[model samples]
Target: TFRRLWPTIAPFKAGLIVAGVALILNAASDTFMLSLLKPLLDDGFGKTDRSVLVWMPLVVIGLMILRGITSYVSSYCISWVSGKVVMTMRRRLFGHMMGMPVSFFDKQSTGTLLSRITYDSEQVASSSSGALITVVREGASIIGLFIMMFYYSWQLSIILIVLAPIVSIAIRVVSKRFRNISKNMQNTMGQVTTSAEQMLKGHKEVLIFGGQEVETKRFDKVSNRMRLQGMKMVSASSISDPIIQLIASLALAFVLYAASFPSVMDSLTAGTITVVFSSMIALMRPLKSLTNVNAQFQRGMAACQTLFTILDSEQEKDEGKRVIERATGDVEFRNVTFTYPGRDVPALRNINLKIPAGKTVALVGRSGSGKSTIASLITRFYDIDEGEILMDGHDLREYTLASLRNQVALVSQNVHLFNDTVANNIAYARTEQYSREQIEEAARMAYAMDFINKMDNGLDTVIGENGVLLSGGQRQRIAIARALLRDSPILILDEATSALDTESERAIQAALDELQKNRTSLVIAHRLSTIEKADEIVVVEDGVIVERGTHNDLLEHRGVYAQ
Candidate 1:
């Protein structure tokens, strides 16, 4: 787990070197001070020297100053490294997520995936620094104190060293529990975030349906699950420290008792015994800290596992080598069939259709009858199960995704507008390509100029997130304007004007009329009146095209289209 985190932090090798050096200096100084306890006792007052008092106390002050300086430097450097690690991991995670296929998003919630980048990435910072700091600085302190204890009396050092395995065994056992609970906690936190985000997004619906109590109870369930995992992690971690301290203290008492015998009294001086005991007692703190940091390491690894899982997931495949400046806008579905991930039934089946260059095709169907699925397949959001979708007689798989998408523009029922000026949203991909005059011209064609000009800042007005500040019709009009600006050879309008009332729809229909000219247009509509002027209307039912004809022919036939 720690190995996986190294790539992000490895670039900060200079910082790690500085921190490691500081740990060494701080540990040496700390150990040196313990040695002075003997000198300060024997040479300063026990031997009765006034000169020793002045020099010894001054030396102690110098050592204390060095320890403080090195400790501060080590902490600062490690913290800087950890923060950088988090920043690097977050950017990588977000970048990787952007490349994931749309199907990956279908199985995951928005807030849960966000939690991996926001909260889980935070946990990784500890291993990059906090756990390393505990292992390095405290670990060096332990090594230095051990050397000092051995210098005083190797026999007594052996007694303490014999008990070291007991602490190690305890740490090993508790670390596994910490990792298990930490993983559970990370998963629970994602659920908690998802629940909260869902409630916040649907706050209006919750109130309108009088569902406050139900929402509160649902929130409680996930929130309490998070709390339980947290408590279990804390309990496992808290227990290890005391267990280490108890074992170390017992070893200390036994070593001290052994020194009371006449056989060892001649060899052990008062100052020597104090040196051994002081460093021995001091060793317990770092040992306990080292064991405690194992818990932090476990938490960090658990987070890394979650993040790595996402980073390792397969991204969208764009392996097609074909490139085209522009497609001729002739599209055909040759025995096309597709099903969503994990579904037994195909969303689109045996679908065969074609639209010639510069023609308009209307797809009319009831909800879930696969009207929109054809548009999605044309855009290559999901690959067809069995057949080829051809553009200008070439299989879609032959064209590079970027090249193919560049030739198509979509304005769907779900209008996604960024929190930007109206001009920017319309000129999104081609911001530099289109001049301000051209952008406003597209807006004029979409009949969005009226509302856009009415705003205080007009084209430059900042819309809120997803254009929440705008009305449904206003957002839909902006989407139409955006698609108009693209001017791609193929245009897809999947119920683009559903948000508009009859009056607004009537007004926008003229703009839609002009935009559909000289382009291959696929219009998916539910309202019977909307597709009347379409060159051809195809009615779909249960993933199959049930009827196909001009509006009057379909109405005269009095089949699914008339119904």
Candidate 2:
């Protein structure tokens, strides 16, 4: 785990070093404070040394002041380093997710990914800093206390050392148990978040379908599992500490019995015996803390393993070296075949199609006939398994992914708008490139300006999340406006007008007619009327192109197109 975390921590080496020094000083102060008991007991009680009375209280005060300074410095530096590490991890995680292929997202839940960022990253931070502090500071104090005990009487120290193997065996069993519980706890935390998010996202459906009781019970189960896992962790840590403390107490009893021997008592002064007894008691605190810290450290390692799995996964492949300022809008699919990840059935089979520059082709098919899959291929969201997709006589894979995507503008049925002003939504692709006049012009062309103007703040109105405040038709029109503002050489409309009423559809269809005049456009729609005037119509069924012709020619054939 430290090997994995080293890169993030390496840059803050100076802070860590300073914290290490302060911690050593802090531990030394604790040992030194206990050692003061010797002079105060022997000299002051015997009245043989007058200086011991004067300096004992003063020296004790000075040790406490030193401890205070070292404690504050150590704490502040450790926190600074830990905070930096967490921020770096989160930023890298988010950036890596952005570069992943669309298929990667298909297999992951949003809540799980979110938990890695918000919850798992926090666990790692505490483990990295908190566990390190306890191990270093407490370990030093334990060593210092042992030196004092052995100095007072080596025989009694040997008795205490005999119990080391027993305490270690207990720790080993507890540590192993903690690691398994921590991993399960982290998974259950992700499940809890997933359940709550599902309920929140689908609250409306739950209410309308009378699924409230079912959802409530489902959430109860998930949350209960999380609670049970948390309790298991608490139970193990709490039980382990007291058991280890009891073992130390048993060792202390032997030390006391050994010290009472007449031979040992004759050699030891009152102050010396008192110091050994007190130091043995002090050892219990650090030992118990070290045992408890093992749990936190294990939890951190589990979280790191989860996060590293995603971080190390391959990002989307962009191996193409070619870059284009603009494509001529000619596209072709030659013997292309693709199956979505983890699916045996192909989504697109040995398909062949062509669209020349400055022409429009419409694909019409049943809901699951793979019409939209063609559009996804053109954008290279998922690379084809066989053959090639060509743009301007060059394979789509030959052009850089960004340049290839820049040539096409898409407006699908599911319009996604940000929580921003109407004008910003329209100019989303290049926010700074378009002025207010240009934004208003695109909205006007999409026939969305009328409704937009009616809103309280018009261009500056803050749309609710995903445009929830807007009507379905209003959202679709805004999406159309965004695509229009993009002004790419190729355009794709996959049921783009499905949300609009007849009158609005007719008006926008006219605008679309003008928009497609000299650009290559692929229109995928269920409404045959929308594609009747398309220059070419391709009918697809079950991943194959079953028919291709102009509208009048296909109608005359009186086959699937006529149906």
Candidate 3:
């Protein structure tokens, strides 16, 4: 378990080592203070010594105050180190998760991943940080105090020490159940959190479908399980304290009874026995805390295990070195075979296609025929399974991922606009570069200018999530204007005009015509007419290029293209 979680701390072990040293010193000081009680009580107080009244309490108080100060300092130092470790762990975990193959998301739930990122990390911050700090500082102090008692009276200390083995074995057995239960509690609660989030987001739809009873029952089931798990965890931990307290009380009884026996009482001064008894209390407190720490440490280790799993995911994929510059219009695919990671079938099989500079090519097919898949490749949303693509005669891989995408612009079927201004949405492409005039001009080309002018704040009006406030056509047009402002040589219109009415389609088609001129554009169309004016049309069926030619030429072929 230590090895599993060590990687997160191994990098910063130097700081941890320093903190550990401080913790040891702090504990040793407390043990020394426990030793000083003998001198303060025996030499100074029992006789009518004036020094005992003034100096003993003051010395004890001063030592305790110093001990308290060291305790605070030790904790503060550990807190700083833990905070750094947590920050580094969180950053690396997120970076690793984001880099994981898209297939990994499909395998995992978004809610569970979110929980791991949020709740699990917090558990580590609290539990993980405390685990080692308690083990080092408190555990060592308890041991030192025990040794001090042995030195003070070997007879009493031996009896207490002999009882420890019996207690230790019992504790070892009980704490195993605590660790298992605590892990289960966290797992069940994670599911509850997942259920609550899903219900919140889909509440309206759930009510519409009369799923209130079903969802309620579902939540009740998980909720009940979570409560039981939480209770079980508490019960399991409860075993440690009672057994530890029993041992301390048992040791206490033997000390008092043995002192009462006539032979022992006469030999040792009352001062010496008082010192031993007082030190036992000090030693008992930290020993009891150690027993409690076992449960706490178990919970913390479990949390760290969950967090570290995500941090260790693969990171080499999507590892782009540089951003794409202004890309040339030319695009070519050479024997590209593509399949999603962890899938059996290829989405696009070995196929070759080419589009020259300043030309428009339309891809048409039924669902799963690789229409939108082609568009994703151009953007490099994922790498090809088997082959490479060439852009402007240079291997696509040669260009830095962002640099490659920088020279290309895309408008997808789903237009995702943030809750922001119309000008911001339209100006999104080159928001920093374009002046107000350029933004308005691009909006006018996509027919978004008319609606912008009518809004409360023409350029500043806030759109809702995914442009909920805008009409479908309006959303589509804004997406187009955003692409237009980018003014890249290559443009992708992936079902860009599919949702518009006939009149709206014609108007947007006119805008697209202007945009397509002197550009290399790939249009993935759902509406057959969307591609009617394309310079060349390719009809893909079942991942194959079944028909290809200019519009009239394919129409004459009367093959798959004729459809």
* Each candidate: RMSD: 5.0, 5.1, 5.8
Q: What is candidate 3's TM-score against the reference?
A: 0.73
TM-scores vs. true structure, each candidate: 0.83, 0.82, 0.73
lDDT of 2: 0.77
Per lDDT, the best of the predicted structures is 2
Quote the lDDT for 216 in model 2: 81
Per-residue C-alpha lDDT of model 3 across residues 316-428, encoded as one tens digit per residue: 35444544455564688888899876677777897778887778777764555677678778877677878878876677776665466667788764777777777776665
Question: Residue 457, candidate 2: how far off, in angstroms?
Answer: 6.8
The TM-score ranking, best first, is: 1, 2, 3
What is the Cα-based lDDT of residue 240 in candidate 1? 63
Cα deviation in Å at residue 24, candidate 3?
4.2
TM-score winner between 1 and 3, please give it.
Answer: 1
Give the winner by TM-score: 1 or 2: 1
Q: All candidates' lDDT scores?
A: 0.76, 0.77, 0.72
